[PDB]
Design a protein around this ligand. Structure first.
Ligand code: NAP
Ligand code: NAP
Ligand code: MG
Ligand code: MG
Lengths: 401, 401
């Protein structure tokens, strides 16, 4: 008899290679054990295009309603993808949108396995990213300037006052952009990182470029220090774990040089880049969990990598792939784990935790996709294609479940 | 008889630990061999403060006049430094300013030594950063919004037309920022990177976040592809070296995973962060050269790291330091090498090239500062303080010069 679910998972379907893998994961690792209850939204590019991105919006709202989302990597359009898919427009990141609607903090952490040695010598313990989910460049407005004139950054009070600053005097074509974040949102971001480093029992690092961005970045600096001063210093000193702030360039540099083991808070953009640096450096983009947690307690689970286009094209040429499903497995089990917790289905959480251990265990035993092949200390090794990796995880799981 | 110079070097003095080292390098490694001809500008924070940052400006102009600058790491002020130094204001980055005035591209590359093994397993050859020296956040305007109202990005043609886009509707205090770059400048940046990868005989990678920043970043993408299409494809295919564009998150990820050996072009901000990632990951922030090259042919040599505040404070407490001078040595020899080339003083260029080899050679032989101690494959090792490192380089140089 399959495991039964109460509240539905919001399920958001994706693109290209992850879309393929999303289906294989449901059919081989989930549906045979759980009567999967989800509310389906197809965030595939083709469907986002048919519904003029309305589906993305509805899927956000549904996460708010039911409380947990799991989301497949999707394509974010640019001139190339507009051409490739004949899009009505260059749609905004659906992750940007969902994130804007929920607010919150995306937590990303490698998926560790004993016999998988990181590229960076001396990385002995996981490094977590705590990425601010809201604003900055993900909510920019930009403008191409066609020839000479005047760019201005402009604010108009609810009262009367206006201030204008000059962005630049063009005597030629170039680009401009404006963007924003809100203290409310920084404040949630800072508490979320502090909470999280405690929950994890580690130092929190935070970093920006406050010396160059003297008010915007400088705000994030201040709010963190404030929130730390009179809201966490106490609990922190208590556990003997420090809060560490430095310049973003300095921070990457010390990260590379550390043994890992800290939580690393980053503004939106930096969190994007650094979650790729850290997953890759730990082993593979696929070996990393990602969950958005809204201030208001809602969750979206995802992969941190994108849609593996390159692999997708190879698959379309008829080649076989070796694409690593770990991150999207873990998104499903993360989401199912949380669904269970909230609805009091112990069988769902033990299922999820067991499925997670089977997965890691499978790689520990030397069966893994190409991306890990060269990091493994396992003598006898078995590099498998995309499907076989999943069949093999299923084997190890069934034998221990 | 000391070596004689023709045109003066523009010399820009710095702060804290680099200020100390700048003097030790002149006195032990330069002045005893060269009648040093320079035009001195003190970009120390205290002097920038006394002259209300005018000295920074004059030093830029002088680089333009004479053609080569060498520059010590300087402090860029923030609320903390305003307090620490009782500044009349939070002065703008002097590097930002000089860079804005010259335009150009900052090239940074590790300083390789056989027996110094990078932190990132598999980095077998240098990775170079080619950082756009101009604009974006280094020329931002920012504004704190105090409560509700309307932020707008605004452009006004030289003609009549105005366009306004809404940055955001605040009903609360937060931050906003606007910034720009110009096609002229992107165009020079792109040719500079292409030239440079040829001069180096390697693939050029370039990357941004064009899917999210759909016009601004997307412009950089386009201009690179254009300039490549009909200005370098030919020379490139010719040498069997490819031009590679991907998303910035994807790019860090593939970098970590590559064997190095490419030139990696980055927008201003990203070039800052990534030059720290790469120097650190190669060994130390100190083991990296940096030179701005203006479109109009002018050069500023510098360290890529900052002023080593932490070491400075330790030195002030009376502790001895082990601060690595390599990068600022190399700035001086880079600058002297170029001065020589331009003025036809072969003795100056051979001096500089010899001084560079003595330095590397010294570390090859196992004498080095703390930051390298743990990367060295040299059996018998001699970790020295800041001064001794310099005396030891002097020894090895004198014996081969
Ligand atoms: N929805 C999202 O969270 C998300 C995230 C990032 C990008 N995007 C979208 O995804 C599309 C492609 O982006 P991208 O190519 O830059 O990044 P990507 O999908 O993360 O793929 C980057 C590369 O890293 C390796 N890799 C990533 N995931 C892997 C996995 N599961 N198994 C094995 N190898 C893996 C592959 O490298 P090799 O080819 O070297 O084997 C892959 O080509 C873009 O259109 C972008 O908009 C979506
Ligand atoms: N003018 C510039 O190009 C420049 C560049 C960056 C920063 N800045 C300014 O410099 C000040 C300090 O910035 P920061 O502390 O972030 O960066 P930093 O001066 O580069 O120092 C960062 C850390 O990296 C290690 N390191 C850097 N250079 C070293 C060297 N030559 N020898 C041995 N170790 C070295 C040291 O680490 P350990 O303490 O771990 O030993 C140092 O504390 C800031 O006020 C900033 O505005 C200037
Ligand atoms: Mg990403
Ligand atoms: Mg820097």
């Amino acid at each position: 008899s399959k495991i039964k679910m109460k509240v539905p998972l919001v399920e958001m379907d994706g693109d290209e290679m992850t879309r393929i893998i999303w289906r294989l994961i449901k059919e081989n690792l989930l549906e045979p054990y759980i009567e999967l209850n989800t509310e389906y939204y197809d965030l595939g590019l083709e469907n986002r295009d048919k519904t003029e991105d309305q589906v993305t919006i509805d899927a956000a709202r549904a996460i708010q309603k039911y409380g947990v989302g799991v989301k497949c990597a999707t394509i974010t359009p640019n001139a190339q993808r507009v051409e490739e898919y004949n899009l009505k427009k260059m749609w905004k990141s659906p992750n940007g949108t969902i994130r804007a609607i929920l607010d919150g903090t995306v937590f990303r952490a490698p998926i560790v396995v004993n016999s998988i040695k990181p590229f960076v010598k001396g990385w002995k313990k996981p490094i977590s990213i705590a990425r601010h989910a809201y604003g900055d460049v993900y909510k920019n407005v930009e403008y191409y300037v066609p020839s000479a004139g005047k760019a201005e950054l402009v604010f108009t009070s609810e009262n009367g006052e206006v201030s204008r600053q000059t962005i630049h005097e063009f005597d030629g074509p170039g680009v401009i952009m404006g963007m924003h974040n809100t203290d409310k949102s920084i404040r949630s971001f800072a508490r979320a990182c502090f909470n999280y480093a405690l929950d994890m029992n580690q130092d929190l690092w935070f970093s920006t470029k406050d010396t160059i961005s003297k008010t915007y970045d400088h705000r994030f600096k201040d709010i963190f220090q404030e929130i730390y001063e009179n809201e966490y210093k106490e609990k922190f000193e208590a556990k003997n774990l420090q809060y560490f702030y430095t310049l973003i360039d300095d921070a990457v540099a010390r990260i590379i040089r550390s043994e890992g083991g800290m939580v690393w808070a980053c503004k939106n953009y930096d969190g994007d880049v650094m979650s790729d640096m850290v997953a890759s450096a730990f082993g593979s983009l696929a070996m990393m969990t990602s969950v958005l947690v809204s201030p208001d307690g809602k969750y979206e689970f995802e992969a941190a990598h994108g849609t593996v286009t390159r692999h997708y094209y190879k698959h379309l040429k008829g080649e076989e792939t070796s694409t690593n499903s770990m991150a999207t497995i873990f998104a499903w089990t993360g989401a199912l784990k949380k669904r269970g917790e909230l609805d009091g289905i112990k069988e769902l959480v033990d299922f999820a935790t067991k499925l997670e251990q089977a997965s890691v265990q499978t790689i520990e035993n030397g069966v893994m996709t190409k991306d890990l092949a060269s990091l493994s200390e396992v003598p006898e090794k078995k590099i498998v294609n995309t499907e076989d990796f999943l069949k093999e995880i299923r084997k190890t799981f069934e034998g221990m479940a």
